[PDB]
Amino acid sequence: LEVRPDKVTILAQAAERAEDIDVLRAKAAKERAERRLQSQQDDIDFKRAELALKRAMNRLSVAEMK
Amino acid sequence: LTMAEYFRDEQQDVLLFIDNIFRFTQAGSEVSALLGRMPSAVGYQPTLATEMGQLQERITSTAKGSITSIQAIYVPADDYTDPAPATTFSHLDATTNLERKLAEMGIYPAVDPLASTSRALAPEIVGEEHYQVARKVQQTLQRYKELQDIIAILGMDELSDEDKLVVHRARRIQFFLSQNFHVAEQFTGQPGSYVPVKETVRGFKEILEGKYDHLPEDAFRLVGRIEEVVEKAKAMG
């Protein structure tokens, strides 16, 4: 808590305008958790990309040069 | 040829040094036109093949005398598909195919390590030890060859810690394949070397076996026996 005569700063690792209950910020710490793991797409595009990059290189884009 | 044929069939072994057997076939096409012949592929004489058949087998060793011949074969426009040298291939027990690329690399003699061949490469001829190294070198030289498009596009950054090693060895092996030819010196100024077969076989072993994976490439460039590389190595710093 930064208490200044003219201002109050609340540092929070995690803060969500939430109800009386706390066992919500956990709820938000929940519905956000795996819904951040679900971000395999991040990984999987790059796969498909590292894929294409090694399929245009498959034809050995140079056969003994030429 | 008739000269060497003398000492072979009239008396001993003979070394027939024919410089550019190409000029024979070449001059051939020069006349083939005027003979009133139907031009063949590329405009070469329709007899190119046979004309060379009747002058090759003659250069051979018999039960009477032996003929070890080494012929220079020019490659027109660097095209190994050209009827002249192409057709020539099926005439040799051993070949040494020279590449312009390797030449500009500074690799001399610029000899294709994956093209040059010999009927000798057999375990039933050169021994196992010499054989396996032989292919081992070629293997890792090829594996480097394939990698080249990636290197040329993505650099070495995305190569495995295993393929990289193969890039180092390969290079240093492709460099150690360079040699000091006594008939050089007057230009470059380096003296020269004849590397014994046992010492070549061994030298590459260690390199494939990784005793040298520390020494920089340039150390292995233009040398003799593998010991020299270590010498020229320290000289580097």
Side-chain angles (χ1 to χ4, degrees), chain A residues 1-3 5-6 8 10-23 26 28-29 31 33-35 37 39-47 49-53 55-57 60-65, chain B residues 1-5 7 9 11-19 21-100 102-124 126-128 130-141 144-161 163-164 166-171 173-181 183-184 186-187 189 191-197 200-201 203-204 206-208 210-216 218-220 222-230 233 235-237:
Chain A
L1 182 60
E2 255 286 345
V3 177
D6 56 298
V8 177
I10 300 185
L11 291 185
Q13 297 291 140
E16 189 167 355
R17 314 188 174 194
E19 303 167 305
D20 232 310
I21 231 182
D22 190 7
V23 183
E31 278 295 43
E34 193 197 319
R35 274 169 192 57
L37 296 169
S39 81
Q40 291 193 127
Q41 299 174 324
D42 294 293
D43 181 318
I44 301 146
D45 165 65
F46 215 83
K47 301 274 193 63
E50 282 186 305
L51 179 67
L53 240 296
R55 284 187 169 194
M57 283 172 134
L60 227 167
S61 295
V62 154
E64 320 150 348
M65 201 44 188
Chain B
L1 183 44
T2 299
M3 307 267 282
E5 286 203 297
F7 303 118
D9 304 306
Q11 296 190 313
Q12 303 70 29
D13 310 45
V14 176
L15 286 175
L16 176 53
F17 290 102
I18 302 193
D19 198 325
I21 196 66
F22 172 66
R23 309 303 193 183
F24 154 78
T25 300
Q26 181 176 53
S29 70
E30 311 186 46
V31 306
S32 164
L34 296 173
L35 290 173
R37 288 173 170 171
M38 302 276 343
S40 194
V42 182
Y44 275 119
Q45 55 237 299
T47 72
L48 170 154
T50 51
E51 287 185 322
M52 190 162 323
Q54 303 172 44
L55 159 63
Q56 270 304 307
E57 292 291 64
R58 186 183 292 100
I59 310 174
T60 181
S61 63
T62 60
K64 303 175 183 187
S66 178
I67 298 180
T68 316
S69 69
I70 302 179
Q71 314 170 47
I73 311 172
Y74 179 71
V75 189
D78 301 65
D79 173 47
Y80 280 69
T81 73
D82 185 65
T87 312
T88 301
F89 276 119
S90 42
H91 295 110
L92 314 164
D93 303 293
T95 56
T96 290
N97 308 309
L98 307 176
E99 298 185 313
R100 181 181 300 295
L102 298 180
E104 309 177 304
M105 290 301 270
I107 299 290
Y108 288 116
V111 171
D112 189 325
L114 306 176
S116 305
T117 51
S118 156
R119 298 178 57 217
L121 255 196
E124 278 210 343
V126 298
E128 278 198 53
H130 181 192
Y131 182 92
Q132 284 172 240
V133 168
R135 300 298 182 185
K136 203 63 177 180
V137 182
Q138 294 176 309
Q139 271 194 55
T140 66
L141 291 168
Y144 174 68
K145 200 167 179 179
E146 295 183 51
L147 301 179
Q148 274 168 317
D149 186 299
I150 311 169
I151 338 300
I153 302 289
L154 303 157
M156 292 181 262
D157 275 307
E158 215 204 334
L159 297 180
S160 172
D161 287 303
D163 280 289
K164 291 191 71 292
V166 180
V167 183
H168 290 63
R169 281 196 304 177
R171 280 191 75 65
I173 290 185
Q174 191 172 242
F175 285 112
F176 189 60
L177 278 183
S178 66
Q179 234 154 289
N180 291 88
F181 285 160
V183 287
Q186 38 214 349
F187 293 89
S193 56
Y194 175 109
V195 184
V197 171
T200 304
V201 182
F204 287 107
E206 306 174 314
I207 303 167
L208 291 170
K211 278 182 181 180
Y212 300 123
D213 293 42
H214 65 298
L215 314 174
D218 328 56
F220 294 87
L222 292 187
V223 290
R225 47 181 181 79
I226 182 66
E227 293 70 52
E228 299 193 323
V229 181
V230 188
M236 314 292 298

